[PDB]
Design a protein around this motif. Structure first.
Motif, PDB file in Angstrom:
ATOM      1  N   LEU A   3      46.372 -34.111  43.535  1.00 30.49           N
ATOM      2  CA  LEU A   3      45.807 -32.869  43.006  1.00 30.49           C
ATOM      3  C   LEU A   3      45.846 -32.835  41.483  1.00 30.49           C
ATOM      4  O   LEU A   3      44.987 -32.228  40.856  1.00 30.49           O
ATOM      5  CB  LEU A   3      46.551 -31.659  43.582  1.00 30.49           C
ATOM      6  N   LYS A   4      46.823 -33.508  40.893  1.00 33.50           N
ATOM      7  CA  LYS A   4      46.911 -33.592  39.435  1.00 33.50           C
ATOM      8  C   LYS A   4      45.745 -34.409  38.888  1.00 33.50           C
ATOM      9  O   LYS A   4      45.172 -34.085  37.847  1.00 33.50           O
ATOM     10  CB  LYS A   4      48.245 -34.222  38.985  1.00 33.50           C
ATOM     11  N   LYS A  11      38.515 -31.062  34.231  1.00 33.89           N
ATOM     12  CA  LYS A  11      38.528 -30.895  32.781  1.00 33.89           C
ATOM     13  C   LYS A  11      37.365 -31.648  32.138  1.00 33.89           C
ATOM     14  O   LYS A  11      36.749 -31.174  31.183  1.00 33.89           O
ATOM     15  CB  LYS A  11      39.859 -31.398  32.208  1.00 33.89           C
ATOM     16  N   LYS A  12      37.064 -32.823  32.679  1.00 31.08           N
ATOM     17  CA  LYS A  12      35.978 -33.646  32.168  1.00 31.08           C
ATOM     18  C   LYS A  12      34.624 -33.069  32.563  1.00 31.08           C
ATOM     19  O   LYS A  12      33.613 -33.327  31.908  1.00 31.08           O
ATOM     20  CB  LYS A  12      36.101 -35.095  32.661  1.00 31.08           C
ATOM     21  N   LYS A  13      34.612 -32.279  33.627  1.00 29.46           N
ATOM     22  CA  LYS A  13      33.379 -31.659  34.103  1.00 29.46           C
ATOM     23  C   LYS A  13      33.080 -30.380  33.321  1.00 29.46           C
ATOM     24  O   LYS A  13      31.947 -30.160  32.889  1.00 29.46           O
ATOM     25  CB  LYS A  13      33.450 -31.344  35.612  1.00 29.46           C
TER      26      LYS A  13
END
Length: 14
Positions: A3-4, A11-13
């Motif tokens: 999940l991490k 975040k990249k999306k």
């Protein structure tokens, strides 16, 4: 499955 890892991929999306 980590999940991490999956969450950090968001975040990249965003």
């Amino acid at each position: 499955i980590n999940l991490k890892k999956l969450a950090a991929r968001i975040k990249k999306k965003i």
